[PDB]
Amino acid sequence: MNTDITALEKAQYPVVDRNPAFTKVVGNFSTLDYLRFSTITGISVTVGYLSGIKPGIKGPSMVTGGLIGLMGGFMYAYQNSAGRLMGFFPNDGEVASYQK
């Protein structure tokens, strides 16, 4: 395949690793990304538990909500980390990490 990742609107901020690998952006997760991942997963688990008490399925609903929240939070954290490396986001941390 022929793949070209070039945004129509260029990054206003300094760019590092214009095509970041999955492993590195997973390893670039900051404390804010982990916090938002955790809060999304917790909200999803709480909603799954609370909703599934009338039908009686209290645990399976928890597991389903946990899966949904894990996927959503991981997608959000990955998107934020990528946009930081791609330069679309403020990314003031790893721009300093790049220099050293």
Binding site: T31, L32, L35, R36, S38, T39, I40, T41, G42, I43, V45, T46, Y49, L50, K58, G59, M62, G66
Partner: peptide, 30 residues
């Protein structure tokens, strides 16, 4: 009268606490 004995509801409570803490940290750290 010392343990909740409901190992399923306990996970929901700790998950809710984690969600509240994460929301607070999101509001402050960002």
């Amino acid at each position: 009268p010392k343990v909740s004995e409901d190992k399923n509801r306990n996970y929901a409570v700790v998950a809710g606490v984690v969600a509240i803490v994460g929301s607070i940290g999101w509001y402050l750290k960002a």
